[PDB]
Structure 1
Amino acid sequence: VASKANDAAGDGTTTATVLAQAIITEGLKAVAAGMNPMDLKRGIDKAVTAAVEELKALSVPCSDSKAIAQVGTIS
């Protein structure tokens, strides 16, 4: 995950890693509850497709020098 994040984005590799560890921890806990893993997967995936759509919505353009310098800075 951390590796792929890096090749595409260039940043967020830690976040990516922290999310992945989280889904896994919680996933496996459900698998141990008798849940069907292949369905937990379909759920996760659907939740993600939706979250991606929602992020597209929230995103506002970033074009002025001041905004750019800010992402640079936090980065």
Structure 2
Amino acid sequence: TVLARSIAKEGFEKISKGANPVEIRRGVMLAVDAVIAELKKQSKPVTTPEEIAQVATISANGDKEIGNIISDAMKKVGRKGVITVKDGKTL
């Protein structure tokens, strides 16, 4: 959403009388294609079960118990197994 607003805001400024927004669009998508082409180069596969524990901990807003539970559940079922969450009752 912040990326959407930023492209909207920066787009609703350059619209003068001589600008072609449709070509600006073509350039926007050329740039997006090239940048998602760079992410994949500097990407690296996740191999160790501690990288699973880190990915979980970060997107859970830094809750480290969540990271250990999700890493444990994914070790005992497989990284492409079926984990599913429910409304617990305990504390």
TM-score (norm 2): 0.60
**Residues 39-66 of structure 1, C-alpha deviation per residue, up to 9 Å, x if partnerless?**
1100100000000110010111112111
d(CA) in 2 for partners of 1:32, 1:25: 14
**Residues 5-33 of structure 1, C-alpha deviation per residue, up to 9 Å, x if partnerless?**
xxxxxxxxxxxx11011011001111147
1:28 paired residue number: 12
Matched, 1:49 2:49: no
Question: Unaligned regions of 5+ residues in structure 2, if any?
Answer: 60-91
d(CA) in 1 for partners of 2:16, 2:6: 16
Aligned length: 59
TM-score (norm 1): 0.72
Identity %: 46
Structure 1 runs of 4+ with >2 Å offset = none
Structure number with higher relative contact order (C-alpha < 8 Å, ≥ 6 residues apart): 1
| Secondary structure at the counterpart of residue 40 of structure 2 | helix
